Design a binder for this molecule. Structure first.
Ligand SMILES: CC[C@H](C)[C@H]1O[C@]2(CC[C@@H]1C)C[C@@H]1C[C@@H](C/C=C(\C)[C@@H](O[C@H]3C[C@H](OC)[C@@H](O[C@H]4C[C@H](OC)[C@@H](O)[C@H](C)O4)[C@H](C)O3)[C@@H](C)/C=C\C=C3\CO[C@@H]4[C@H](O)C(C)=C[C@@H](C(=O)O1)[C@]34O)O2
Ligand SMILES: CC[C@H](C)[C@H]1O[C@]2(CC[C@@H]1C)C[C@@H]1C[C@@H](C/C=C(\C)[C@@H](O[C@H]3C[C@H](OC)[C@@H](O[C@H]4C[C@H](OC)[C@@H](O)[C@H](C)O4)[C@H](C)O3)[C@@H](C)/C=C\C=C3\CO[C@@H]4[C@H](O)C(C)=C[C@@H](C(=O)O1)[C@]34O)O2
Ligand SMILES: CC[C@H](C)[C@H]1O[C@]2(CC[C@@H]1C)C[C@@H]1C[C@@H](C/C=C(\C)[C@@H](O[C@H]3C[C@H](OC)[C@@H](O[C@H]4C[C@H](OC)[C@@H](O)[C@H](C)O4)[C@H](C)O3)[C@@H](C)/C=C\C=C3\CO[C@@H]4[C@H](O)C(C)=C[C@@H](C(=O)O1)[C@]34O)O2
Ligand SMILES: CCCCCCCC(=O)OC[C@H](COP(=O)(O)O[C@@H]1[C@H](O)[C@H](O)[C@@H](OP(=O)(O)O)[C@H](OP(=O)(O)O)[C@H]1O)OC(=O)CCCCCCC
Lengths: 362, 362, 362, 362, 362
């Protein structure tokens, strides 16, 4: 029978001794805050500035003794979010972030629900440009581990304690997909406490293990390099007397291998360690460069042939240099793709075992 | 005869028991909100970040019993938008969005119209960077379906219910055109209700079917690839003894095919499935590569010819290798464009039937 | 003798019955608002997102009967812009716009001047990213018509009427120049009234006719294409037996024509109609491709010559094929630039007459 | 002995008749405002959108008679910047600007100092994206004159007059350097008064003469063009019978000259007048194109030689065509670099005299 | 026993004489402020606009006598950051900065802790786009010294004095790494006082010495240039009669050296001094150009050979020109890589000693 306006100005009134600046149960045990997040959107992962953009529904549960009411019989009592000025919302800030803008569209995207015993549910929707450091030791295949840290500002560990939720940890939205990565099902909850000269502060963090998909990099980078190496193999069947043809074919394959290697590393930060694509493009470039060196040795042997022919064992030395120049081409035509196939299976199995070692060590 | 200032401070006065924080007909049936949007601008569709930018006139109709007035005889009573602080505007937020900024130019772009029985018309102009996931299984021709979701924050399904309008659904502005797409005439209205641990929330969505126009991609991508394949066909008429000419022509056609294929995929996200342009550029690249292989086989047969000529059935084996080297060119000159025409009609009709299957399944 | 503070709190005081929420002469004829704009900056015209950025001094003149004062003898009475909260500024918003931010530097850039009879002068400085659709049927030469629409939000045609000024229409700043376009001297004032389900709203618009300057596109695009076609003509004087030279020259001219055509269309939206540069680059590419086809026919005739010479009317058939192979080069050397000159004068005069037809039809 | 709180609420109190909306010495002579700016940062000069970014310390000095105090004996009395709401700051706005955001970091970056007789010192730190039109008649060497205009909004010339400072004009920070330009020591102070239909408004402007440094453009653009022309000269020493070598060398030098000319104009607005780099790249391209034409004439004369040799004064006509084909190469080998050196010294001295004429006319 | 609300409204109440506009110990000695910063994130260093982005925890310690309390026995008394409106926070602003936005996510990221004797701890989290000028005299290896200046606005040296902290200077976060640079362990604390016409202002600065990592530039820039020079060395073994082969190989190596040199300088400001990569690419380009000149001299000597052979000491002059043309190739094949190795060791040791001289002079 009681009207709701006096009831919802009674608990936050200045005739009441609420004092929203003062934390609950002052001069006592620390407040325990339970947090669960809901990943609404995850994406826009950029490697060159090492950050990613999430959309989260940050839900914070804490108990306030002064907010308890015994008049109304309903337990939930969902409230309007405009009177969220004097409730004592806890301070929370993300340790590694940029941006972090609120959503003010059509209303402030906020949820306030005060239970009968004093439990408060506080939900806010925020997009954060979270910055995570990434390791690029293996660029085509890798398991990145993005770190999201939630800690407090201005309340030490003896006054405010942040804890993860027990029923579930992180709720991902159904149907959420990433175009370049695959989000793993398990998520780590390791809370570490940062120490500062001012004091220690409560901090909880969650880790997402991101598997990079290998379907795009196989089409864009691995197959055109094989096309270039196969073309340099095609140069072996051409006639050895046709010098501009073989020289031009080999030179253009080396040039396009260099430009392809320079263009695949363009969308990457300037890291100072050797990656896997470096190894792949280096061995492919070495293969086309060795093909050009093989033709240069063949044409040098033919040069020695032509100088000793035109100005005495001349016939059998002509035979020896033509037979040797034919033997080099005949053994190269078999030896080049076989050693390339050996390198391919060795590289692929060692990266398969180091990828499985990364997924086993985690 | 009554002056308007007391009348428009009477209904929102604190001597009145309006209480704009409290929802209308509290502790009763849920409020029913009818929404229709007016697409003022639609465009700026970017594939690489998978989002689009709309300009909408969001109109929300709901009934308030406390707002009803019986003194004035006029039914419409358009009001000034500055007193839109205490009216109980409903909470609405878009589920998949970025940005969503209001228009504050020369006034707040808002409309408030309170009917005599209590019906409230609330119109706001907002630009939203709506994020939609897109499928790129067929890149030149495709029918994208952009999804716009409108749901509530902080009021469950038992308290707030969102419904679409019956007289029309989505009003598009007259004369509105898209440079890259064609907006279909019908629009789906399927409302789905999202479930969360806190509770269930009302949500309505509208789907726009966007037909990608095929006029630009025919000029930019399909015809230069045909030019490259026709040039590789031109290489068959050149003399077989002119080895640097045919080798250089074929090598530059393969190189420019590779760079054209790498440059057409630049304005696209790094997806991990095979698209239609992948198939097209792959078959065209295979055609120019097979032309280079055909010349390599011709010059290998001529090599065998020259070695057996210069160091016995020599005349008729010279005839056999010259006749075979002529026969390969003569059959290739006919066989290459005919099999290319066969591939063209097969690819085009299978993509026509899969495009019509996409437009029939919807 | 009267001090100014009471006089300027008398007309906007709450002891006065001003009521700035209520429009002037309520329940009567509509308010007539006269608007003239002053183009302070115009520029930053981008084709790929189809919008332009103006800086305008929006001046709005309307009459308020309650604001009239008879105490002071001065007629102008320029006022301070801080008390522009309760004056009843009219609602105005641009129909096709993005951005539209106010200038808050060192003060709010505003002007308020209330005349003695009640005339109010309201000037504000705003930069608007106005979005205009453009037609690219002729890309090098074209006359774009940018549309600026000013309409009201929340006041129908019976309550608010917008009208253009009679003394002048749009004042452009002296010395204002555009690097890529030429602003015409006349400007259209056609007011059209938009109709919506809620009601009809007053709207006035102004059109600027922008002539695209042809000096840059002649240097960047038209002359290098002529350089490529002249180089392909140079290929006719080279010896026909030198096959790698003529083949390589023609192939590199075709390749660079393709890359030049692909690079000139890069700073343009993905439109689906044929433009004028498409026609120009297509005919130039056809010319260099026909030159390569002419050399392929010459070397095919020489191939027939060489096969019938080396394995009977042999001398006179050698004469016939050498004379025909010389005659093809001799007639091509004259016929190629003459038909190119004919195409040039036809293309140029038809685009001159369609440009003058566009400027005559307007 | 007087406490400071009553003294600093006495002069701005509503029990005082200060009335900060009303300008000082109302209904009298115009207020005289003295302005000096301090260039803290100058840079980020972009040619393609024709604007530059400054950081200025805007100091405004004006006298207020009502602010005068005779109680305290100190003359300076530096005040706190939070009570800068009611002081009657003068209206000032920059005529050609974008952005112009204030600095709100750790405090509002403001200075307020009220002298004993009524002199007010008002300093604010602002970064402005000032837009200046630039002339690109000579692109490598040029003296740009950036214009910064400071005028008033809403107060005419009879009420507000802006004047420059007498002790110094513009203070540049010590150690301030520009990477691409050199700031001259003198600065022009020409005040021009803008006239509008509403009235005339006071305006003062300052001009900075910016000398473009020529060290970068000599390395990036002038020397690689000389490398290309020297390579085309190297083509003269190669054997005339080696036709693919000389043809390929000349064709690749023409192609790379075209791409170098197209790439140096990329970071520039689309202006419609001929610049100096246009002239330089045009003459260098003409030189490499004439070298290709010279080889085409040599090989045409050799063609006439070969046709009259193989199907009578044959020996002496063979002599005449070989001697003439040798004489063309021998005279070209001397004549090409000498005429290039003549063009170089003529171009360089005429641009030196037109640069000195620009610096003498100013 | 005293409740906290009256105690925390007593010290900031208007019944108290706090007067937060007035600085502490007015008309006396200057306030001494001790500042220590905590580098939370450091990165996003861009060379082309010469600025870097930090995340700092700015801690300011100063003593206020009026804030002292003797009632409560606790010494720390951490307070809520909402009542940081009237505390007299000191004015602080960074001298060389852009941006500098506060963090408003979930709360204002602020810390307020008032000690018992009057010591105030004020911590704020800010991201600043700090602009630092950089010297690019040696581009691959260099030690940049970023300067962060903290000074006051509106309080002179006699009223406000800024001092660095004694216990530590700058705290870097543990685990913080930079992808392109290495942050040195020591940091300079040199405070310089800026002088202005208005007065002198306190300023303290901190310098970070940044070592540029050399691992990326060795892979991206130094090794492909060696590949190009090694390929030009490979051109010496090819047959001298094969003129199109050697000419084409040398010409394409010169062309790709030019494009590689133009592409490595793309991500750099337009500086006007010679860098180290300029010297490296210039010597490598000189090496490939000299190889092309060596082949041109060889083919000129062979031209003289062919003209004196075909139209008398003819046999021994044929011997002299063939022996000399062989001797040039034989001495070049040894002399080119040896002088390249000499240049490599000289360049590397002189840059090692100038890098160590830069790290010794600091
Ligand atoms: C025919 C292909 C072979 C390879 C020929 O190619 C070349 C020379 C000769 C070869 C045999 C190549 C090609 C053009 C042709 C010349 C043909 C014409 C001048 C035009 O084409 C026709 C055909 C076209 O329908 C395939 C048809 O479009 C319709 C489609 C739509 O209605 C269904 C509608 O929207 C509208 C009505 O228009 C239209 C009648 O125009 C010319 C306009 C084609 C565009 C040229 C393009 C310009 O930039 C492109 C690209 O940057 C590349 C690098 C160079 C050009 C090129 O590639 O040049 C290019 O692609 O010469
Ligand atoms: C003539 C064409 C053939 C192909 C010739 O081309 C080449 C060499 C010889 C060939 C026979 C090619 C060309 C230049 C010429 C040399 C000609 C001159 C030096 C200049 O040209 C004249 C002609 C021009 O009117 C067509 C005329 O403009 C007027 C137009 C307007 O009044 C109506 C007005 O705005 C103003 C008065 O100026 C003007 C008198 O200047 C030279 C300045 C031309 C520009 C050169 C350009 C620089 O970058 C361009 C591009 O990056 C490309 C890659 C290289 C250059 C080129 O392409 O070089 C380039 O295009 O040599
Ligand atoms: C040796 C030079 C000649 C020219 C050879 O070049 C080519 C083939 C054969 C020529 C004789 C060229 C070159 C690679 C070699 C093959 C050599 C190996 C595969 C690798 O190299 C070694 C040498 C390198 O120390 C110079 C050394 O790095 C250390 C430095 C640091 O410790 C001090 C530390 O960070 C870490 C330990 O790693 C390391 C052992 O790896 C290969 C990984 C080199 C990188 C290849 C690059 C990939 O993209 C680049 C570029 O896009 C270009 C276009 C193609 C590649 C290339 O240029 O290919 C490229 O540059 O083949
Ligand atoms: C879709 C393929 C279209 C081209 C195939 C259709 C072209 C084709 O059939 O080749 C004729 C030729 C044999 O000629 P022939 O029929 O007289 O025996 O084949 C080859 O030897 C090398 C071809 C290169 C084979 C390269 C295979 C990748």
């Amino acid at each position: 029978p009681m009207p709701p306006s006096e009831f919802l100005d009674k608990l936050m009134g200045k005739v009441s001794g609420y004092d929203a600046r003062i934390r609950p149960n002052f001069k006592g045990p620390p407040v325990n805050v339970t947090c669960n997040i809901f990943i609404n959107s995850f994406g826009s992962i950029a490697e060159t500035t090492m950050d990613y953009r999430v959309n989260i529904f940050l839900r914070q549960q804490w108990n306030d003794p002064r907010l308890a009411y015994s008049e109304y019989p309903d337990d939930s009592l969902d409230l309007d979010p405009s009177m969220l000025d004097s409730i004592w919302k806890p301070d929370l800030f993300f340790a590694n972030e940029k941006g972090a803008n609120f959503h003010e569209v059509t209303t402030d995207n906020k949820l306030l629900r005060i239970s009968k015993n004093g439990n408060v549910l506080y939900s806010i929707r925020i997009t954060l440009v979270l910055a995570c450091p990434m390791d690029l030791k293996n660029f085509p295949m890798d398991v990145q581990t993005c770190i999201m840290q939630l800690e407090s500002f201005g309340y030490t560990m003896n006054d405010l304690i942040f804890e993860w939720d027990e029923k579930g940890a992180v709720q991902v939205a159904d149907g959420l997909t990433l175009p370049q990565f695959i989000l793993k099902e398990e998520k780590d909850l390791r809370y570490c406490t940062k120490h500062y000269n001012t004091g220690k502060f409560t901090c909880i963090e969650a880790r997402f293990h991101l598997e990079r998909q290998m379907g795009y990099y196989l089409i864009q980078m691995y197959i055109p390099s094989l096309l270039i190496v196969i073309l340099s193999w095609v140069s072996f069947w051409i006639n050895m007397d046709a010098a501009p043809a073989r020289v031009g074919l080999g030179i253009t394959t080396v040039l396009t291998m260099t430009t392809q290697s320079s263009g695949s590393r363009a969308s990457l930060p300037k890291v100072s360690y050797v990656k896997a694509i470096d190894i792949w493009m280096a061995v492919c470039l070495l293969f086309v460069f060795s093909a050009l060196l093989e033709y240069a040795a063949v044409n040098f042997i033919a040069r020695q042939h032509k100088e000793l022919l035109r100005f005495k064992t001349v016939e059998e030395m002509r035979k020896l240099f033509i037979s040797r120049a034919k033997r080099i081409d005949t053994v190269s035509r078999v030896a080049f793709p076989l050693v390339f196939l050996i390198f391919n299976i060795f590289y692929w199995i060692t990266y398969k075992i180091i990828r499985s070692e990364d997924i086993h060590k985690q």
